[PDB]
């Protein structure tokens, strides 16, 4: 198969910045008929991908001229001369020359803002849930930037990984931050077996883990 | 005119099969073909030319997918066989012609052994009291339901600033969703904060007031 890779995977920009996204194929995308079926797509959240550039450098009708494509063979580049807000989203390159047709992994064009430390909140199981027989501990990590964050659960000081469900929001339209929810689900017996429950976040805004805990018996 | 229509969301049990559809209509094109693309990350499954019935597959999907055409109605179909959780995804139909292409809205497929199951709604209240002039974060945990969607609001939609509702996640055949809301310490608990959860498929409506522990 022809493998397509994009660089960078994440591209934070300010509005008005120039943006460049590259695509490399493992074999040449030039078809024997002379055409190079290299396309560029933009996908906005909750929407279908939309064609921007086809066959390396042809702007599809209606696509603004701030978008341009170049390259040949195995190396291709999409350029945005001046990024506008409607441009934010995930960009995919696509090769349609060689079966199986393949896509790059995508590049997220996002808004750059100042760093923001997460607001971390931890919650014990509700009495409702305990009455029903289960025990979930919840940790919200809210309104942070940049988007890269890692969360670790510790029970009585030991890391726990089974029973964890994580969910992430898209970049906020108003303050350009990200948020994350982590839910550790235990049996009620397990919850009653341990006392100290800790949510630990690793984020660029602190050199040490950002910790929130509670003791069950308090 | 031009229209590209895909069939609606599908819920299927593991090991079962499903057949979804795509139709291009209008007076704006002659020859065309229809490709199927999977998104969990885009993957091309195959292509069918409805006017000739010719198909080309991604060998990866040769057993998993069968592309057909109902030439009576000009409707293309993709059958996905012997479903596993690997197959839960959005499936796009992508139209190609001499002068333009176009992607449909997508068909979501969810694989689960669960029948319709109402959610349990749990309040998330802080275990420690709040300092003066601080922000307090409350939450709502919505667990064990099927299928999507559940809806969550706060104070019947009158609490909208400072809300984060997190996308639902399917795990062990059931969904979990959560929602947080942040308010000044001077407003809770002195004013009530309630998460309102609705699950249309089970005709469920739950109001859970967040009370201090």
């Amino acid at each position: 198969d022809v493998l397509m890779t994009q660089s960078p995977l994440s591209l934070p920009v300010s509005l008005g910045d120039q943006a460049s996204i590259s695509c490399r194929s493992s074999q040449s995308i030039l078809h024997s008929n002379g055409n190079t079926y290299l396309d560029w797509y933009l996908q906005k959240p909750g929407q279908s991908p939309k064609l921007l550039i086809y066959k390396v450098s042809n702007r599809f009708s209606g696509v603004p001229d701030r978008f341009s494509g170049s390259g040949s063979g195995t190396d291709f580049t999409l350029k945005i001369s001046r990024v506008e807000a409607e441009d934010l989203g995930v960009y995919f390159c696509f090769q349609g020359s060689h079966v199986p047709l393949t896509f790059g992994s995508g590049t997220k064009l996002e808004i750059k803002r100042t760093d923001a430390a997460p607001t971390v909140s931890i919650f014990p199981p509700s009495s409702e849930q305990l009455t029903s027989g289960g025990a979930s501990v919840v940790c919200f990590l809210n309104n942070f930037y940049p988007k890269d964050i890692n969360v670790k659960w510790k029970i009585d000081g030991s890391e726990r990984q089974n029973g964890v469900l994580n969910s992430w929001t898209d970049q906020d339209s108003k303050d350009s931050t990200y948020s994350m929810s982590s839910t550790l689900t235990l049996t009620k017996d397990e919850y009653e077996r341990h006392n100290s429950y800790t949510c630990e976040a690793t984020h660029k805004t602190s050199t040490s883990p950002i910790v929130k805990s509670f003791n069950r018996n308090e | 005119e031009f229209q590209l229509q895909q069939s609606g969301p599908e819920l299927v049990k593991p090991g079962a099969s499903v057949k979804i559809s795509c139709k291009a209509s209008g007076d704006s094109f002659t020859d065309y073909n229809l490709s199927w693309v999977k998104q969990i990350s885009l993957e091309w499954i195959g292509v069918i030319n409805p006017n000739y019935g010719t198909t080309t597959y991604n060998q990866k999907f040769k057993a998993k997918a069968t592309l057909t055409v109902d030439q009576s109605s000009s409707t293309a179909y993709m059958q996905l066989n012997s479903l596993t959780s690997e197959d839960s995804a959005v499936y796009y139909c992508a139209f190609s012609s001499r002068l333009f292409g176009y992607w449909g809205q997508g068909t979501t497929l969810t694989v689960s052994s669960a029948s319709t199951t109402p959610p349990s709604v749990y309040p998330l209240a802080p275990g420690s009291a709040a300092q003066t002039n601080s922000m307090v974060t409350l939450g709502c945990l919505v667990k064990g339901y099927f299928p999507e969607p559940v809806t969550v609001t706060w104070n019947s939609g009158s609490l909208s600033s400072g809300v984060h509702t997190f996308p639902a996640v399917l795990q062990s055949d059931l969904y979990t969703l959560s929602s947080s809301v942040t308010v000044p310490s001077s407003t809770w608990p002195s004013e009530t904060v309630t998460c309102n959860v609705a699950h249309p498929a089970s005709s469920t409506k739950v109001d859970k007031k967040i009370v201090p522990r």
Partner: peptide
Amino acid sequence: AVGIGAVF
């Protein structure tokens, strides 16, 4: 030809 299946 334009679109995912333009080569066919």
